[PDB]
Short mmCIF file of all heavy atoms in Angstrom, two decimals:
data_model
loop_
_atom_site.label_atom_id
_atom_site.label_comp_id
_atom_site.label_asym_id
_atom_site.label_seq_id
_atom_site.Cartn_x
_atom_site.Cartn_y
_atom_site.Cartn_z
N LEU W 1 -6.20 -10.87 -19.41
CA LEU W 1 -6.71 -9.70 -18.71
C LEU W 1 -6.26 -9.60 -17.27
O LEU W 1 -6.04 -8.48 -16.77
CB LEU W 1 -8.27 -9.79 -18.76
CG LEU W 1 -8.84 -9.37 -20.19
CD1 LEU W 1 -10.33 -9.65 -20.17
CD2 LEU W 1 -8.62 -7.93 -20.54
N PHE W 2 -6.20 -10.73 -16.57
CA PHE W 2 -5.69 -10.76 -15.24
C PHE W 2 -4.18 -10.43 -15.14
O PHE W 2 -3.69 -9.67 -14.33
CB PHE W 2 -5.99 -12.05 -14.46
CG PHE W 2 -7.35 -12.06 -13.81
CD1 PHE W 2 -8.45 -11.78 -14.49
CD2 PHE W 2 -7.42 -12.48 -12.52
CE1 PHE W 2 -9.67 -11.82 -13.78
CE2 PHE W 2 -8.55 -12.52 -11.87
CZ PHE W 2 -9.75 -12.19 -12.50
N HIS W 3 -3.40 -11.02 -16.05
CA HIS W 3 -1.95 -10.87 -16.03
C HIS W 3 -1.47 -9.54 -16.39
O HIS W 3 -0.46 -9.06 -15.91
CB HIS W 3 -1.33 -11.96 -16.91
CG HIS W 3 0.14 -12.16 -16.66
ND1 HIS W 3 0.86 -11.53 -15.61
CD2 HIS W 3 1.13 -12.91 -17.25
CE1 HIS W 3 2.07 -11.87 -15.64
NE2 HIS W 3 2.22 -12.73 -16.56
N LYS W 4 -2.23 -8.81 -17.25
CA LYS W 4 -1.88 -7.45 -17.68
C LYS W 4 -1.97 -6.51 -16.57
O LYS W 4 -1.35 -5.36 -16.54
CB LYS W 4 -2.69 -6.96 -18.87
CG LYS W 4 -3.88 -6.24 -18.45
CD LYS W 4 -4.80 -5.93 -19.66
CE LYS W 4 -5.91 -4.98 -19.28
NZ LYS W 4 -6.98 -4.95 -20.25
N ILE W 5 -2.74 -6.83 -15.46
CA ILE W 5 -2.94 -6.03 -14.29
C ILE W 5 -2.10 -6.43 -13.14
O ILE W 5 -1.54 -5.60 -12.37
CB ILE W 5 -4.40 -5.92 -13.94
CG1 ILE W 5 -5.28 -5.39 -15.11
CG2 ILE W 5 -4.65 -5.07 -12.63
CD1 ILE W 5 -6.72 -5.79 -15.06
N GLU W 6 -1.89 -7.72 -12.93
CA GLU W 6 -1.14 -8.28 -11.87
C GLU W 6 0.31 -8.34 -12.16
O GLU W 6 1.10 -8.83 -11.28
CB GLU W 6 -1.68 -9.69 -11.46
CG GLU W 6 -1.39 -10.73 -12.46
CD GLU W 6 -2.13 -12.06 -12.25
OE1 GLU W 6 -3.14 -12.01 -11.46
OE2 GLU W 6 -1.71 -13.09 -12.76
N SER W 7 0.83 -7.89 -13.31
CA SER W 7 2.25 -7.81 -13.61
C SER W 7 2.86 -6.46 -13.41
O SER W 7 4.06 -6.36 -13.12
CB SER W 7 2.50 -8.31 -15.06
OG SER W 7 2.14 -7.26 -16.00
N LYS W 8 2.08 -5.39 -13.62
CA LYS W 8 2.52 -4.03 -13.40
C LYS W 8 2.39 -3.63 -11.95
O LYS W 8 2.49 -2.42 -11.57
CB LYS W 8 1.82 -3.02 -14.27
CG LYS W 8 2.46 -2.75 -15.61
CD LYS W 8 1.99 -3.73 -16.66
CE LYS W 8 2.78 -3.54 -17.97
NZ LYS W 8 2.38 -4.45 -19.02
N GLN W 9 2.27 -4.61 -10.99
CA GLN W 9 2.13 -4.35 -9.60
C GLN W 9 3.17 -3.45 -9.00
O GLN W 9 3.06 -2.82 -8.00
CB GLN W 9 1.94 -5.65 -8.83
CG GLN W 9 1.56 -5.58 -7.34
CD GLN W 9 0.04 -5.63 -7.23
OE1 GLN W 9 -0.60 -4.69 -6.63
NE2 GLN W 9 -0.51 -6.64 -7.76
N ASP W 10 4.39 -3.52 -9.62
CA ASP W 10 5.50 -2.81 -9.11
C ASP W 10 5.28 -1.24 -9.22
O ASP W 10 5.91 -0.41 -8.55
CB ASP W 10 6.84 -3.18 -9.81
CG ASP W 10 7.31 -4.52 -9.39
OD1 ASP W 10 6.40 -5.42 -9.13
OD2 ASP W 10 8.54 -4.76 -9.34
N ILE W 11 4.43 -0.84 -10.12
CA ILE W 11 4.14 0.57 -10.40
C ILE W 11 2.70 0.96 -10.18
O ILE W 11 2.38 2.20 -10.30
CB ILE W 11 4.58 1.02 -11.82
CG1 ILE W 11 3.81 0.27 -12.89
CG2 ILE W 11 6.06 0.74 -11.97
CD1 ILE W 11 4.19 0.65 -14.31
N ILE W 12 1.82 -0.02 -9.97
CA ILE W 12 0.37 0.28 -9.87
C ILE W 12 0.06 0.88 -8.44
O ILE W 12 -0.55 1.93 -8.41
CB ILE W 12 -0.42 -0.96 -10.17
CG1 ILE W 12 -0.64 -1.13 -11.64
CG2 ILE W 12 -1.83 -0.82 -9.47
CD1 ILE W 12 -1.70 -2.15 -12.08
N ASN W 13 0.52 0.22 -7.37
CA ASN W 13 0.13 0.62 -6.04
C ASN W 13 1.33 1.22 -5.31
O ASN W 13 2.41 0.76 -5.44
CB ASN W 13 -0.41 -0.57 -5.25
CG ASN W 13 0.40 -1.89 -5.44
OD1 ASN W 13 1.59 -1.84 -5.86
ND2 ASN W 13 -0.17 -2.99 -5.24
N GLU W 14 1.01 2.33 -4.58
CA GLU W 14 2.00 2.95 -3.64
C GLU W 14 1.37 2.92 -2.22
O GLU W 14 0.18 2.61 -2.05
CB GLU W 14 2.29 4.38 -4.11
CG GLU W 14 3.14 4.45 -5.43
CD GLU W 14 3.01 5.82 -6.07
OE1 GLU W 14 2.83 6.82 -5.30
OE2 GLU W 14 3.09 5.91 -7.27
N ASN W 15 2.16 3.35 -1.27
CA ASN W 15 1.73 3.40 0.02
C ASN W 15 2.71 4.32 0.87
O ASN W 15 3.86 4.35 0.53
CB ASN W 15 1.61 2.05 0.75
CG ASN W 15 2.65 1.07 0.17
OD1 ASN W 15 3.86 1.22 0.41
ND2 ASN W 15 2.11 0.05 -0.48
N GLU W 16 2.16 4.93 1.92
CA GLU W 16 2.92 5.89 2.77
C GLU W 16 3.24 5.16 4.09
O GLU W 16 2.21 4.73 4.82
CB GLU W 16 2.23 7.19 2.98
CG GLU W 16 2.96 8.16 3.87
CD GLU W 16 1.95 9.01 4.70
OE1 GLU W 16 1.45 9.96 4.09
OE2 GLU W 16 1.85 8.69 5.85
N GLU W 17 4.45 4.96 4.46
CA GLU W 17 4.82 4.35 5.65
C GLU W 17 5.60 5.32 6.57
O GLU W 17 6.67 5.88 6.09
CB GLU W 17 5.66 3.08 5.47
CG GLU W 17 5.28 2.24 4.26
CD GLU W 17 6.07 1.11 3.90
OE1 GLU W 17 7.20 1.10 4.47
OE2 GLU W 17 5.70 0.25 3.11
N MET W 18 5.18 5.66 7.75
CA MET W 18 5.80 6.56 8.57
C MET W 18 6.00 6.00 9.97
O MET W 18 5.05 5.29 10.51
CB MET W 18 5.07 7.87 8.69
CG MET W 18 3.49 7.70 8.72
SD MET W 18 2.66 9.24 9.16
CE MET W 18 3.65 9.84 10.52
N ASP W 19 7.16 6.23 10.54
CA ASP W 19 7.45 5.71 11.91
C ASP W 19 7.38 4.21 12.02
O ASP W 19 7.01 3.63 13.11
CB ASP W 19 6.61 6.36 13.01
CG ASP W 19 6.92 7.89 13.05
OD1 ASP W 19 6.23 8.56 12.24
OD2 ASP W 19 7.61 8.35 13.93
N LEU W 20 7.78 3.52 10.96
CA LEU W 20 7.71 1.96 10.88
C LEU W 20 8.98 1.37 11.44
O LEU W 20 9.22 0.20 11.25
CB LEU W 20 7.43 1.50 9.52
CG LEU W 20 5.99 1.25 9.15
CD1 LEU W 20 5.83 0.32 7.94
CD2 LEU W 20 5.19 0.73 10.33
N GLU W 21 9.83 2.16 12.15
CA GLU W 21 11.10 1.65 12.65
C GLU W 21 10.99 1.65 14.13
O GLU W 21 10.78 2.69 14.75
CB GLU W 21 12.30 2.48 12.24
CG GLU W 21 13.60 1.77 12.24
CD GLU W 21 13.67 0.71 11.17
OE1 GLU W 21 13.00 0.86 10.15
OE2 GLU W 21 14.39 -0.31 11.37
N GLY W 22 11.12 0.40 14.73
CA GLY W 22 10.90 0.32 16.23
C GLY W 22 9.57 0.55 16.75
O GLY W 22 9.45 0.90 17.91
N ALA W 23 8.51 0.35 15.90
CA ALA W 23 7.15 0.61 16.27
C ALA W 23 6.60 -0.64 16.94
O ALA W 23 6.72 -1.77 16.49
CB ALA W 23 6.34 0.98 15.04
N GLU W 24 5.89 -0.38 18.08
CA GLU W 24 5.20 -1.50 18.75
C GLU W 24 3.80 -1.69 18.15
O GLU W 24 3.44 -2.97 18.07
CB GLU W 24 5.04 -1.14 20.22
CG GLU W 24 6.15 -1.61 21.13
CD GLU W 24 7.23 -0.59 21.24
OE1 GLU W 24 7.75 -0.06 20.17
OE2 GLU W 24 7.72 -0.29 22.33
N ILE W 25 3.04 -0.73 17.66
CA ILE W 25 1.80 -0.89 17.14
C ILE W 25 1.77 -0.22 15.74
O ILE W 25 2.49 0.77 15.52
CB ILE W 25 0.58 -0.37 18.02
CG1 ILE W 25 1.02 -0.51 19.51
CG2 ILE W 25 -0.65 -1.07 17.80
CD1 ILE W 25 0.16 0.13 20.47
N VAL W 26 0.86 -0.58 14.91
CA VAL W 26 0.60 0.10 13.64
C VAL W 26 -0.94 0.41 13.60
O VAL W 26 -1.68 -0.32 14.18
CB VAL W 26 1.01 -0.75 12.38
CG1 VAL W 26 2.55 -0.80 12.36
CG2 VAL W 26 0.43 -2.14 12.51
N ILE W 27 -1.25 1.48 12.92
CA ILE W 27 -2.65 2.04 12.90
C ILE W 27 -3.02 2.01 11.50
O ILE W 27 -3.68 2.97 10.99
CB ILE W 27 -2.58 3.38 13.68
CG1 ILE W 27 -2.62 3.25 15.14
CG2 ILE W 27 -3.84 4.20 13.45
CD1 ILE W 27 -2.88 4.55 15.95
N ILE W 28 -2.71 0.99 10.78
CA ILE W 28 -2.99 0.86 9.35
C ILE W 28 -4.41 1.30 9.02
O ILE W 28 -5.41 0.83 9.64
CB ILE W 28 -2.80 -0.60 8.80
CG1 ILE W 28 -3.17 -0.73 7.48
CG2 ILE W 28 -3.51 -1.59 9.77
CD1 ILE W 28 -2.84 -2.11 6.80
N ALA W 29 -4.57 2.19 8.04
CA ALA W 29 -5.86 2.72 7.68
C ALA W 29 -5.65 3.37 6.31
O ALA W 29 -4.57 3.43 5.76
CB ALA W 29 -6.38 3.72 8.71
N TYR W 30 -6.82 3.85 5.68
CA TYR W 30 -6.80 4.39 4.35
C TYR W 30 -7.88 5.50 4.31
O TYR W 30 -8.78 5.57 5.10
CB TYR W 30 -7.09 3.30 3.31
CG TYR W 30 -8.44 2.73 3.42
CD1 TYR W 30 -9.48 3.09 2.64
CD2 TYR W 30 -8.69 1.75 4.37
CE1 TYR W 30 -10.74 2.51 2.66
CE2 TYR W 30 -9.95 1.12 4.47
CZ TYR W 30 -11.00 1.51 3.65
OH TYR W 30 -12.21 0.95 3.75
N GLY W 31 -7.66 6.31 3.29
CA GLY W 31 -8.70 7.31 2.96
C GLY W 31 -8.61 8.53 3.96
O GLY W 31 -7.67 8.75 4.70
N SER W 32 -9.76 9.25 4.07
CA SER W 32 -9.90 10.52 4.87
C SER W 32 -9.59 10.17 6.34
O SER W 32 -9.26 11.10 7.07
CB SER W 32 -11.17 11.15 4.61
OG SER W 32 -12.21 10.29 5.00
N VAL W 33 -9.87 9.01 6.77
CA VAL W 33 -9.63 8.61 8.17
C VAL W 33 -8.17 8.84 8.56
O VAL W 33 -7.88 9.23 9.69
CB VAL W 33 -9.97 7.19 8.44
CG1 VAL W 33 -10.08 6.86 9.94
CG2 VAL W 33 -11.33 6.75 7.79
N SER W 34 -7.22 8.69 7.59
CA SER W 34 -5.82 8.93 7.84
C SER W 34 -5.64 10.41 8.28
O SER W 34 -4.76 10.72 9.13
CB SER W 34 -5.02 8.66 6.61
OG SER W 34 -5.21 9.70 5.60
N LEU W 35 -6.43 11.31 7.83
CA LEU W 35 -6.32 12.74 8.28
C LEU W 35 -6.49 12.91 9.80
O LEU W 35 -5.83 13.68 10.41
CB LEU W 35 -7.35 13.56 7.58
CG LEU W 35 -7.02 14.02 6.16
CD1 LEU W 35 -8.33 14.38 5.38
CD2 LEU W 35 -6.02 15.17 6.12
#
């Protein structure tokens, strides 16, 4: 049950990364706060 979920990790989770080149700080957050 654990392996069937932790093996598809390449397609399960996505993320949006913007301005991650030459950045001094990151403002990592999730949900409506990102708005």
Side-chain angles (χ1 to χ4, degrees):
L1 284 171
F2 270 54
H3 197 3
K4 94 188 191 196
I5 300 158
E6 72 195 17
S7 77
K8 267 91 188 178
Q9 189 90 235
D10 290 32
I11 63 175
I12 278 194
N13 42 22
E14 293 161 28
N15 32 68
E16 180 215 280
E17 322 174 348
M18 36 170 318
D19 297 82
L20 267 200
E21 205 67 30
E24 269 88 311
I25 329 172
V26 290
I27 276 190
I28 175 175
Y30 64 100
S32 60
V33 193
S34 72
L35 280 158

